[model samples]
Target: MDYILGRYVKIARYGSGGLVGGGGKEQYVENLVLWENIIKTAYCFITPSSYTAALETANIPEKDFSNCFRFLKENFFIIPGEYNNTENNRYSRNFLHYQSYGANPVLVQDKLKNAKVVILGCGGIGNHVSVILATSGIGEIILIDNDQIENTNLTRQVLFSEDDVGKNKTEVIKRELLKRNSEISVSEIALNINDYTDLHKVPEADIWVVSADHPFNLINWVNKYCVRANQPYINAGYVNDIAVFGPLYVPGKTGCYECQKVVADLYGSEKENIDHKIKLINSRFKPATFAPVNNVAAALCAADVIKFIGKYSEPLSLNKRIGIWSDEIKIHSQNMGRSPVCSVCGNRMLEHHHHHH
Candidate 1:
């Protein structure tokens, strides 16, 4: 019989130094005080022999091991493993990740392994996000991108190589991602998302991601359609050094993106300034982005999707936008219901509170 350490274990040392002569156990009772010996317990895992030794050397009783195991097992840090006479149960590492969340690893496996998603765009953020989803074992993906891999893209686009230059992005991403995990199914379509009709082409999916800010900048439509269909979507992008990962739009729970626009426009002169500011920022020339910028955005966005599917945690994306960059990070949340005033949501126009309903 053997066991391996589980994830999410927190270890600490506690000691009140005293002499073995008087209190003895605190400093050196020659194996007396138990708290002092905990310095040796590994945070990730403690082995059977190590536990045994710690008990003997620290003057703790043998059943201390049983009690500790009972507590950890109750908390899901030690679970029924899937290894048979094997390597320290290290093979369970793949499924062990969920232990930190108090989730059964096998259920996490099935939840992720059975999701269906659509990824828009195949460059930079899209490429990295797709890879994370695939490697995490999402069961199905529908890729929609129409660009061709180019030499210029090699700087940030990960789904292509020098050999792949000039190839269609959707085809290349499908082929390359298959190399990462072959058990999943990936389908492709070359749709110019700016066209309204192109959006109709998206297949029914559990969730959608908009990774491209295009000639069309299709996120407005993406938000509308997802909300109308009552599905969730994530829109990820960056503003200079700032990486913006949300407005994680969920049906009805959050305001639709256009509803966000309504809030921005509600103030008279403020709307004018907002438009001007966007124009000025878009004009910034030859901006610099490190390769890892895409990675930060991708990983966080992927996490939002995972939580939505796995039900592991509350999603920060819903009805909110989390902007992560540095010490001055911004995570803002807004409450928006069906706006009677917005045409996109087709709710209604605001009635004057002054004139009595």
Candidate 2:
């Protein structure tokens, strides 16, 4: 039986020096001479027996061959099992594309395909995130936005075309997402999410996404409702060339903003200073948003949701604001303290911890 490599695999054709020289070892270090041949031969996907035979015939060291195979496994450059025609198989291919990242790719794909997502804003960020979640195999999507798509939205929103100008965003996006994945279910609510009451119109969902902008109160309302309901939610945004990611709220595992915030002022620490900084930053947000950056914001938010839903080996954004600028786009986090005194989750955490004792 013949083994097979992943459908997509590539190694640098150009040679690079070892660690001692001006190196280009990528994520793993190896001699460029061997990598050059490895890239060409990995395309063959022969069985272990013939593979070893061919490498010996070609005079490639056995140790180098082993290294290449190890790299393929670690980087998801090999696809397992026989290729199949099932729908889950189709989605799994894409999921496994990032297999080595953290989550169990097959399980993540299965979970994503079974998941339902609620998106609060259907403008640019909503449209973008919907596309990703749809293709990534979310079984159902609930879209909420009160606005209609205008010709102005063409730059960032993908659901509406120039021909769709003046159409309601929720309706237009619903049609677009359904068209993209008929196997998946799509629904829409043509309502603005100013308060949690409007959110009541939304059905049950595995993950809730709040991308709505304006009237900043929307964030507070969503945070409150999600924490109370024990729902997982993601709030993503694009502003002033900066794409903001998450604070994925999972009730017991993570602290809700209510736990992080005081009675007044939103967000962590130094309200006056942070608020002023936010004011200046908020000033950079609208009237003109870069389309690519808008899409990036959507994808990153969906990423956090995927990781959270799959229970990947990672932490959700807790003061882990990833800021993306032309020069500096970052996704690392800084440690923050969790509060046990906050009313919403404090008692709940206490009770849960008490049970273990």
Q: What is the clash count of model 1?
A: 2
Record all residue pairs in model 1 with backbone atoms less than 3 Å apart, i.e. clashing.
Answer: 20-24, 340-348
What is the Å distance of residue 347 in model 1 from its true position?
A: 3.9
State the lDDT of candidate 2 residue by residue for 1-357, as single tens digits. Answer: 333454444444343622211222134346666565465456545333245554665455677777665555555554343431145366656554444342346677678778889888887887888888887788889888889778878888866778998888888888788778898988778788665687667777888888876767787777767777777787788666677777777767776766656466645446687778887886886544678888877887887776666665464564455656644755544332357787666664434344555
- For candidate 2, the TM-score is 0.70
**lDDT to native, each model:** 0.67, 0.67
* Regions of model 1 farther than 4 Å from truth: 1-10, 15-75, 78-91, 262-288, 326-357
lDDT of 1 by residue, 1-357 (tens): 333345444443324532211111122323324323323232323443344443454344555555544444555544444321233542266554565555666677688788898898777888888888888888899888888888888887867779988889889888888988889999998876876567778887878888885654588778667767787788887666667787677665666777655435544335786877777876875556666667788889988888787776677777677677644656544443346566677655557658556
lDDT of 1 at 205: 81
